[PDB]
Amino acid sequence: EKVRVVVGDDHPLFREGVVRALSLSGSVNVVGEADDGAAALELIKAHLPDVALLDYRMPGMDGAQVAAAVRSYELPTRVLLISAHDEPAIVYQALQQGAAGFLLKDSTRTEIVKAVLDCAKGR
């Protein structure tokens, strides 16, 4: 039933905010949280979540590097990136590295839930 998610961000209050939005939706089980990219990748390997929602600029290994690695490993997880940067070549390159989508940090509570749920379903 609930869509299973890993959330990754090195800003605690943004991460907490996302985790609460997802958890309070009633439709999402946050199975792991990370504050750096290598840890996010390891949680993805262990939990095999439906969706990973990851900051583009995670330390150690950025969101697109993790997306690339997940696709390279052929894991079932869809990696949705979120960022305060929205430059065309950055979004494009991330999608080229296998990111399922690219969201902005100005997203609302219902927008992020819907993005995660739509991603788990399809796109």
Please give the span between the terminal C-alpha atoms of the chain, in angstroms, as a whole number: 18
| Paired tokens of 117 | 């749920």
Instruction: Specify the DSSP element, H or E, that contains 120.
Output: helix 109-121
DSSP 53-116: EEETT-SSS-HHHHHHHHHHTT-S-EEEEEES---HHHHHHHHHTT-SEEEETT--HHHHHHHH
**Domain count within the chain:** 1
Task: Please tell me the distance from the alpha carbon of residue 72 to that of residue 59, in angstroms, as a whole number.
Answer: 20
Task: Please state, as a whole number, how many other Cβ atoms lie within 10 Å of the Cβ of residue 120.
Answer: 21
How long is the chain?
123
Task: Please tell me the distance from the alpha carbon of residue 118 to that of residue 123, in angstroms, as a whole number.
Answer: 5
What CATH number is associated with residue 3?
A: 3.40.50.2300
Three-class DSSP labels, 15-60: HHHHHHHHHHHCCEEEEEEECCHHHHHHHHHHHCCCEEEEECCCCC
Q: Which residues form the domain of 54?
A: 1-123
The residue type found at 117 is: L
